[PDB]
Write a protein that binds this ligand. Structure first.
Ligand SMILES: Nc1ncnc2c1ncn2[C@@H]1O[C@H](COP(=O)(O)OP(=O)(O)CP(=O)(O)O)[C@@H](O)[C@H]1O
Length: 182
């Protein structure tokens, strides 16, 4: 009774996919692929652009010339990205972010989940490309896979789970650890 699994591991920096076969009678990695420039940090970057554009649209300032402000906005963007894994909407609040002749300025922007999903949709789609490759290299199809286990914090995002569920046709398991997976 062999069991074949797929490990979708999306971290802060890189993306990995691995196909592993288990037999009783033994453990054999059948294929492994990924994307060295596709990670959670790219999800923050997309949200950072949106916050910079909205702050310009509203107040008229470009924060990118201000390095100390861009650090706080990166920190705030990640925080909002995470909350939006569990909430439908959230609020970025950074008082005294910058200043001009009119005085000190404040950021207060509402980000909805739907907004975030539209911003990162293409990054999620990039993760499917190495998946197809791995399966080809293994001489397998999605029907030959028995379980999909998610690894990495970024995979907690409902959208990422919905797309992986659509590819494999199975509900991926996010509860499983590395020992239990085998
Ligand atoms: N609830 C949540 N929803 C969405 N993203 C979340 C999250 N909780 C954490 N994250 C994201 O998960 C990432 C943390 O990744 P993790 O610690 O699992 O791997 P990593 O970055 O150390 C390994 P690598 O560099 O190889 O990819 C951060 O980018 C963080 O923004």
């Amino acid at each position: 009774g062999n069991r074949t699994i797929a490990v979708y591991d999306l971290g802060g920096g890189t993306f990995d996919i691995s196909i592993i076969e288990i037999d009783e009678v033994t453990f054999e990695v059948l294929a492994t692929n990924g994307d060295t420039h596709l990670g959670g940090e790219d999800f923050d970057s997309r949200l950072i652009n949106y916050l910079v554009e909205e702050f310009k649209k509203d107040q008229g300032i470009d924060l990118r010339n201000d390095p100390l402000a861009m650090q706080r906005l990166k920190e705030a963007a990640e925080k909002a990205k995470i909350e939006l894994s569990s909430a439908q909407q959230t609020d970025v609040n950074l008082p005294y972010i910058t200043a001009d002749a009119t005085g000190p300025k404040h950021m207060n922007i509402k980000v909805t989940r739907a907004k975030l999903e539209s911003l990162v949709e293409d990054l999620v789609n990039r993760s499917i490309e190495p998946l197809k490759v791995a399966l080809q290299d293994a001489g397998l199809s999605v029907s030959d896979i028995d379980d999909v286990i998610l690894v990495g914090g970024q995979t907690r995002m409902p959208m990422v789970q919905k797309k992986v569920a659509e590819f494999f046709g199975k509900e991926p398991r996010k509860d499983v650890n590395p020992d239990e997976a085998v």
